[PDB]
Design an enzyme around this catalytic site. Structure first.
Site, PDB file in Angstrom:
ATOM      1  N   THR A 191       1.815  11.407 -16.710  1.00 52.21           N
ATOM      2  CA  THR A 191       2.163  10.413 -17.511  1.00 52.21           C
ATOM      3  C   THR A 191       1.526   9.193 -17.319  1.00 52.21           C
ATOM      4  O   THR A 191       1.912   8.574 -16.143  1.00 52.21           O
ATOM      5  CB  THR A 191       3.745  10.352 -17.804  1.00 52.21           C
ATOM      6  OG1 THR A 191       4.186  11.656 -18.074  1.00 52.21           O
ATOM      7  CG2 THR A 191       4.050   9.310 -18.848  1.00 52.21           C
ATOM      8  N   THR A 192       0.666   8.722 -18.207  1.00 50.62           N
ATOM      9  CA  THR A 192       0.651   7.224 -18.088  1.00 50.62           C
ATOM     10  C   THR A 192       0.390   6.545 -19.362  1.00 50.62           C
ATOM     11  O   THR A 192      -0.258   7.132 -20.185  1.00 50.62           O
ATOM     12  CB  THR A 192      -0.987   7.132 -17.559  1.00 50.62           C
ATOM     13  OG1 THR A 192      -1.228   7.294 -16.213  1.00 50.62           O
ATOM     14  CG2 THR A 192      -1.284   5.664 -17.145  1.00 50.62           C
ATOM     15  N   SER A 243      -0.160  14.269 -12.615  1.00 54.31           N
ATOM     16  CA  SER A 243       1.186  14.293 -13.682  1.00 54.31           C
ATOM     17  C   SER A 243       0.452  13.778 -14.842  1.00 54.31           C
ATOM     18  O   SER A 243       0.969  14.051 -15.991  1.00 54.31           O
ATOM     19  CB  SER A 243       2.159  13.658 -13.353  1.00 54.31           C
ATOM     20  OG  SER A 243       2.864  14.019 -12.240  1.00 54.31           O
TER      21      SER A 243
END
Lengths: 215, 202, 216, 237, 204, 245, 213
Positions: free
Chosen positions: B1-2, B169
């Site tokens: 997740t970014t 992630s």
């Protein structure tokens, strides 16, 4: 209570509803006249499904009616949560008439001005029931409601027989409305629902039109 | 997740990746983490997915009802404050890092951070997620005062590409959204549209 | 708040002759990450009370919201009664102890500076409800690294001028920049005097690194 | 006490529910909604009696959602309250159920709320009328109206207010003669109907028109230049 | 484990126009045997039984509250319950205690009161119904019962071969479990009769 | 005229046969037995003026304030019954507080007025409560939305006003605010006009002593609602005394 | 995990007399190895005859003295008289036991005058068990002070000593001696000694410098 008799006075002022218990089913025809041509008759429905196998109709006061349509459908589905079996029609009428009796015992409210004709099909066997604003319920072969229900209840008592089919029961439920219609019914100003083994359904106006053409 | 959002002159540019992981299994590789909260106010969702979807739907509800009562477009600081109240009131039940970014006629293009814990701060650029850690130095070195729309889209695309490259992630496609007065332009960067960088081979 | 997330480090404070000066660096760290670098950890409560806070910054934003709405709701009456710095300090002691007693603390450590009726007020409140007043306050690692300098000056000279207190606060902020790993080279200095609360900033420290070449 | 609270008369009537319709007529204002082929308009009059009043705040046209609008007729505080309740039920339908509320479902919901006023004796019926317009995704234009009795119905056209019966007679002679449709005619029919029964030959600062169309389902409140563009087009024919 | 505290071993097997339900007869608190005549199969109708293994106090509690709810049902409705409807009733009763759950796993074996079609099912401790057409087993010797029933069940058995099959299954299954056994009672449920037999089982 | 004894006018929970709620009307008639509060919005602000009657010479000359600060940017001029008006001051004040705590900014006038008119309306349909006997003006200013002046009656209806008047001489005050170009004047001319309009509609031979209370909000106060300076007030007093002559 | 307590140090002391009650405490508020302030007295005037000494967790000490002051005012409202020393003792027993299951981490010593004019010292545990003593040290250096007070005020382990009643001047000398001797060896004790003397004339209050380490 006096409000129960005055609530029955609002039922007998309502539109005629006729329900006939045939051998293989139950009809529920009602009177649905629009006060003017401005009203979309497609919009609001008087014959109303409660389950896939129970429908009902009324005479009297429509807004009071929707309150018990909503609560019949809740009692039915909370039966179905518990038992995973469609609710018996008689059990549902006991539940709904218990609700309709609650608003007569409590003060600060009035009774419902509505009397229900609950139809059903369960265990291969049809049911006709009337719940009064008192909370009392009666099983019927055939009965009338609303405006001149007395004359309808003796018109039915003359044309009712037990070895009667569902299509012939649609034919003699249109006739019981037609004995009090005041001005040439059509497929857009009555409303019929039938139970049979296939479940409850409200007849499409194209299907009411052919029944009216047969008369 | 970014997740990432940059304020520019006239509006904001938002960006997010598309990877949702269940541990180290990519459960969803095309995740839309850019949630339209109102017509010109989006949020960037990071953290627990159930928490972020719950809080985003609830702020969408409260903000749309607020806007219909006030008969006006909502403020971006109003949606950010609703995220702040929800994320601070349930900060021990929620694991949700939110970047609110949008435009409003009163105060231009705005970017608000609501991280875990439930605070709220206005920023020129905000980054969040587990992969924003790998691009703090990049965004400190690269952000210039007063970039345009295309420069902020390119800046957000490059930084999200870097974070997707290093974080496990993070990954997937880059979902960009640029919110201005004329409306919301969204675009998906996938494959060669994601800015490649060379690995220092030999 | 069972677990603080974005915390603020030391908040100083010292009484001088004519008011109180407090300072706080402008950093909110998530763990070790200096993530939020331009956040103001000093509240202006009203005309005669200012408030800097350590600990969780979401809890301090909550206390800003609640205490600022109290100041608004008080000033709507127009009855000539203002919350004193001691009243804000006592309300805040009750709030922090009440949250402590529900086992749900506000993870803060606060310095309430003030100046009412020609008397300076400086008040410490932490997340357990431990409150006291003192001529010099320092939370976090300031209680280790700045409160020595503060209390040695306040031992030699009990009554400071505003310039002496301002220089002492800057000097302790420089020490906390050298030795505290969550501190930051950008701070606000708030002063309350008879003229009200002024918040000056962002201010920086003068760094010295001559000892870096003394390694051979 | 049989005529003071909402209980049945000896002939089965609710007199407070009957007196709420008298209360609708107290406002002095008549609203008309008509429905077209791909459009549904609402027109009410905007009598502003006090001239140092902000006329931009006197309005009976209310946005409920972006796709659903509303004209109110009756006691004005009751009208604003029923509007706030409709806005709540619309937003809560969208939240719980994931799609925008239909016009019949919102009008049914508000009528279900109004039945409770007609049945509990401790509060009165809320003496005003809601007419909801909006574009259905499958049925097209919808015009729904709920009264203080708790009834609602769908309407090819309807009217609410002081001159409701004559507006109904006008529109009833109108909709059995033509199938009134098109964007322009349906504003024409709702401006002529209000004008005929009020007999006052409108200027655009005196009425207000709210539309939905199938081509753009956003509820719009007409600009005074646009009511001019309909009144000039209507006033030379 | 809370299930194995008393032992318990119940199975239900389906035949042609008949069902068989069988349970062990030990009541024991852990290792210590207490009685050898504990009831684990209660009647829920003329042709409809429920068998309960698990914690013996919840065997009694679930069976008594089910008999409560069932007698109220069969009086309020005016019919004997269909066995699928009994399964739904038991599943509701167990799922009401979803996070405070009755440590018993029922088996239901019966005939339809109008059709006389064989019904067997079984449930978990929080009320997941599981209807089969061959056998259901439940108790501390579950795997022994699965081996014996998966080997010995054959379709379309008359009640004599059904008795022999569920009997050999229960006997040789509970003779490889310590906290089960001490007798086996077997109910054969036909259309016209209920046959109830207790078996020469090992008593150790 | 003539009384009614059938008892449709004893609860707000009852309509009359011609469709009126008389308890709301009798509450609104309690407002027109009270002295006149006027409110005028201008190019850069809203100005309030109340003829606060002084019915004992023993009071503290500033008792019974009929001008209220309900938020720091909104003010409230009340007519009618004071104890009901202070209840609604606390309601409007709490509603502004709760809006700021939930949404993060000052409450808009037109939203404060609607959320308080809904409280006033909710006390107009139950048998357990009575309607409020106070009408009141809310007046605000900010930068984005301009001057805002709404008035809420006992019925619960809130309308926007360029000028407004509530009380017993409200009608001649509507007249003398209608003689005024409020859309082009500044706040410092509107205070002189508010003072002279209050001094015109004050019948000294019925109620003989009063204190003129003024409050503005606008550009000149940075969008804060304040009482206004005694210097500006007494210049408005002198202009109203001389203006009357 | 969150800990609702911290030990803030502090030693308190009360001694009863024939016509006096001396309540004393240090003024150092500590935490861990730090010193919050050096002027935080642990004695509190409650009525004109009663001083309470509170030591332990300082947040509970503040809250508890504020509750006791509120209950004094509630008593004087409902009963039209100020409380006695024994009534504050019994009341504080009920207050401390009402918080049995999440206790006030406070060592209370109430020193004052009874209703015949003589000194009264009441010594409480954190959950409200009390008894009337002739003298009591509580808090940080109670295990240090209490043997010397057993020696010199109690006249214990002494042979052929005269059992004179303790006067005010010699009891003041004993208080100053015991807190110097505790400021030497207890690290939480120091920085000043606030001494409150309750007499028939009222409450007079003295301070004596101690060590600053």
């Amino acid at each position: 209570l006096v409000q129960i008799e005055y609530a029955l006075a609002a039922v007998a002022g309502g539109a005629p509803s006729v329900g006939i218990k045939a051998a293989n089913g139950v009809v529920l025809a009602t009177e649905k006249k629009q006060k003017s041509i401005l009203y979309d008759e497609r919009s609001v429905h008087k014959v109303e499904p409660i389950t896939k196998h129970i429908g009902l109709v009324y005479s009297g006061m429509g807004p009071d009616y929707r309150v018990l349509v909503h609560r019949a459908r809740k009692l039915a589905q909370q039966y179905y949560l518990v038992y995973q079996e469609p609710i018996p029609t008689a059990q549902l009428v006991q539940r709904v008439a218990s609700v309709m009796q609650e608003y007569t015992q409590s003060g600060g409210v009035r009774p419902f001005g509505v009397s229900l004709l609950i139809c059903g099909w369960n265990e291969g066997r049809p049911y006709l029931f009337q719940s009064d604003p008192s909370g009392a319920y009666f099983a019927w072969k055939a009965t009338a409601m609303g405006k001149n229900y007395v004359n309808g209840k003796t018109f039915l008592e003359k044309r009712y027989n037990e070895d009667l089919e569902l299509e012939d029961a649609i034919h003699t439920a249109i006739l019981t409305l037609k004995e009090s219609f005041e001005g040439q019914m059509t497929e857009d100003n009555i409303e019929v629902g039938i139970c049979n083994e296939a479940g409850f359904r409200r007849l499409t106006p194209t299907e009411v039109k052919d029944y009216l053409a047969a008369i | 997740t970014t997740i990432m959002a940059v304020q520019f002159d006239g509006g904001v540019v938002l960006g997010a990746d598309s990877r949702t992981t269940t541990g180290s299994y990519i459960a969803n590789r095309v995740t839309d983490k850019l949630t339209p909260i109102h017509d010109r106010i989006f949020c960037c969702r990071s953290g627990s997915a159930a928490d972020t979807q719950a809080v985003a739907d609830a702020v969408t509800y409260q903000l749309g009802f607020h806007s219909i009562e006030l008969n006006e477009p909502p403020l971006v600081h109003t949606a950010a404050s609703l995220f702040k109240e929800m994320c601070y009131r349930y900060r021990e039940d929620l694991m949700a890092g939110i970047i609110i970014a949008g435009w409003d006629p009163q105060e231009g293009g705005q970017v608000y951070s609501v991280p875990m814990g439930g605070m709220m701060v206005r920023q020129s650029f905000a980054i969040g997620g587990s992969g924003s850690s790998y691009i703090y130095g990049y965004v400190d070195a690269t952000y210039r005062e007063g970039m345009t729309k295309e420069e902020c889209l390119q800046f957000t695309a490059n930084a999200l590409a870097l974070a997707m490259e290093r974080d496990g992630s993070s990954g997937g496609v880059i979902r960009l959204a640029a919110i201005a007065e004329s409306g919301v332009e969204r675009q998906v960067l996938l494959g060669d549209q994601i800015p490649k960088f060379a690995v220092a081979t030999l | 708040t069972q677990n603080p997330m974005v915390t603020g480090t030391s908040v100083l404070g010292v009484k001088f002759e004519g008011g109180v000066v407090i300072a706080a660096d402008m950093l909110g760290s998530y763990g070790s990450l200096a993530r939020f670098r331009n956040i103001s950890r000093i509240m202006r409560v009203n005309n005669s009370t200012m408030l800097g806070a350590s600990g969780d910054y979401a809890d301090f934003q909550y206390l800003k919201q609640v205490l600022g709405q109290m100041v608004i709701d008080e000033e709507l009456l127009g009855d000539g009664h203002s919350y004193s710095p001691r009243a804000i300090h006592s309300w805040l002691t009750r709030a922090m102890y009440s949250r402590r007693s529900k086992m749900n603390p506000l993870w803060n450590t606060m310095v309430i500076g003030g100046y009412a009726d020609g008397e300076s007020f400086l008040g410490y409140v932490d997340m357990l409800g431990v409150a006291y007043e003192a001529p010099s306050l320092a939370t976090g690692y300031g209680a280790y690294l700045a409160q020595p300098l503060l209390r040695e000056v306040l031992e030699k000279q009990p009554v400071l001028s505003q310039t002496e207190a301002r220089d002492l606060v800057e000097r302790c902020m420089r020490v906390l920049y050298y030795r505290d790993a969550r501190s930051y080279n950008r701070f606000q200095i708030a002063t309350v005097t008879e003229k009200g609360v002024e918040i000056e900033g962002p201010l920086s420290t003068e760094t010295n690194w001559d000892i870096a070449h003394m390694i051979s | 006490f049989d005529r003071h609270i909402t209980i049945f008369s000896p002939e089965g009537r609710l007199y407070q529910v009957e007196y709420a319709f008298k209360a609708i007529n107290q406002g002095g204002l008549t609203s008309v909604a008509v429905r077209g082929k791909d459009c549904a308009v609402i027109v009410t009059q905007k009598k502003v009696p006090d001239k140092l009043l902000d006329s931009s705040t006197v309005t009976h046209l209310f946005k409920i959602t972006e796709n659903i609008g509303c004209v109110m007729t009756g006691m004005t505080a009751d009208s604003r309250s029923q509007v706030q309740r409709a806005r709540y039920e619309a937003a809560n339908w969208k939240y719980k159920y994931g799609y925008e509320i239909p016009v019949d479902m919102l009008c049914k919901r508000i009528a279900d709320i109004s039945q409770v006023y007609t049945q509990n004796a401790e509060m009165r019926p809320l003496g005003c009328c809601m007419i909801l317009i909006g574009i259905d995704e499958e049925q097209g234009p919808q015009v729904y109206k709920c009264d203080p009795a708790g009834y609602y119905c769908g309407f090819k056209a309807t009217a609410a207010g002081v001159k409701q019966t004559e507006s109904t007679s006008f529109l009833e002679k109108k909709v059995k003669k033509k199938f009134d449709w098109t964007f322009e005619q349906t504003v024409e029919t709702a401006i002529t109907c209000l004008s005929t029964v009020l007999s006052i030959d409108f200027k655009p600062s005196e009425i207000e028109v709210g539309v939905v169309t199938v081509e753009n389902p956003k509820f719009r409140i007409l600009t005074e230049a646009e009511i001019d563009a309909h009144l000039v087009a209507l006033a030379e024919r | 484990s809370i299930m194995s505290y008393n032992g318990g071993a119940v199975m239900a097997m389906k035949g042609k126009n008949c069902v068989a339900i069988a349970a062990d007869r030990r009541f024991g608190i852990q290792a210590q045997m207490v009685t050898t005549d504990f009831q684990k199969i209660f009647p829920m109708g003329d042709r409809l039984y429920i068998g309960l293994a698990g914690l013996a106090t919840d065997v009694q509690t679930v069976a008594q509250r089910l008999k409560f709810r069932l007698n109220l049902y069969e009086l309020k409705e005016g019919r004997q319950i269909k066995p699928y409807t009994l399964m739904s009733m038991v599943a509701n009763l167990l799922y009401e205690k979803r996070f405070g759950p009755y440590y018993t796993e029922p088996v239901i074996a019966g005939l339809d009161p109008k059709t006389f079609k064989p019904f067997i099912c079984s449930l978990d401790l929080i009320g997941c119904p599981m209807v089969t057409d061959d056998f259901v087993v439940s108790g501390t010797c579950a795997e022994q019962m699965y081996g014996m029933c998966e080997s010995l069940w054959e379709p379309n058995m008359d009640p004599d071969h059904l008795f022999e099959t569920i009997s050999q299954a229960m006997l040789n299954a509970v003779d490889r479990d310590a906290v089960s056994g001490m007798g086996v009672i077997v109910h054969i449920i036909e259309k016209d009769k209920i046959t109830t037999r207790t078996l020469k089982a090992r008593m150790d | 005229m003539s009384s009614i004894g059938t008892g449709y006018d004893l609860s707000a929970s009852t309509f009359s046969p011609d469709g009126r709620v008389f308890q709301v009307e009798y509450a609104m008639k309690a407002v027109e037995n009270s002295s006149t509060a006027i409110g005028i919005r201008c190019k850069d602000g809203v100005v309030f003026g109340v003829e606060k009657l002084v019915l004992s010479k023993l009071y503290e000359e500033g008792s019974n304030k009929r001008l209220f600060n309900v938020d720091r940017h909104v003010g409230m001029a009340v007519a009618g019954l004071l104890a009901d008006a202070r209840s609604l001051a606390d309601i409007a004040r709490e509603e502004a507080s709760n809006f700021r705590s939930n949404f993060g900014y000052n409450i808009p006038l037109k939203h404060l007025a609607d959320r308080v008119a809904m409280y006033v309306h909710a006390y107009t349909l139950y048998s357990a409560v009575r309607p409020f006997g106070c009408s009141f003006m809310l007046g605000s200013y900010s930068v984005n939305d301009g001057a805002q002046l709404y008035m809420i009656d006992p019925s619960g209806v809130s309308y926007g006003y360029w000028g407004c008047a509530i009380g017993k001489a409200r009608q001649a005050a509507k007249t003398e605010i209608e003689k005024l170009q409020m859309k082009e004047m500044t706040c410092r001319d509107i205070v002189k006009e508010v003072a002279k309009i209050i001094y015109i509609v004050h019948d000294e031979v019925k109620d003989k002593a009063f204190e003129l209370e003024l409050s503005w909000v606008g550009e000149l106060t940075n969008g804060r609602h304040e009482i206004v300076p005694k210097d500006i007030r007494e210049e408005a007093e002198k202009y109203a005394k001389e203006s009357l002559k | 995990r969150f800990s609702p307590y911290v030990f803030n140090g502090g030693t308190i002391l009360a001694i009863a007399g024939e016509d006096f009650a001396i309540v004393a405490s240090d003024t150092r508020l500590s935490e861990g190895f730090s010193i919050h302030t050096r002027d935080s007295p642990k004695c509190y005037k409650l009525t004109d005859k009663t001083v309470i000494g509170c030591s332990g967790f300082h947040g509970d000490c503040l809250t508890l003295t504020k509750i006791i002051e509120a209950r004094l005012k509630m008593y004087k409202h409902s009963n039209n008289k100020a409380m006695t020393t024994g009534a504050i003792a019994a009341m504080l027993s009920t207050i401390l036991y009402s918080r049995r299951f999440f206790p006030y981490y406070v060592y209370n010593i109430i020193g004052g005058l009874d209703e015949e004019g003589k000194g009264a010292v009441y010594s409480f545990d954190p959950v409200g068990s009390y008894q009337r003593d002739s003298f009591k040290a509580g808090g940080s250096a109670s295990a240090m002070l209490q043997p010397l007070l057993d020696n010199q005020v109690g006249f214990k382990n002494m042979q052929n000593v005269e059992h004179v009643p303790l006067s005010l001047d010699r009891a003041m000398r004993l208080v100053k001696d015991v807190f110097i001797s505790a400021a030497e060896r207890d690290v939480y004790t120091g920085d000043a000694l606030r001494i409150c003397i309750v007499t028939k004339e009222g409450i007079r209050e003295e301070t004596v410098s101690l060590r600053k380490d």
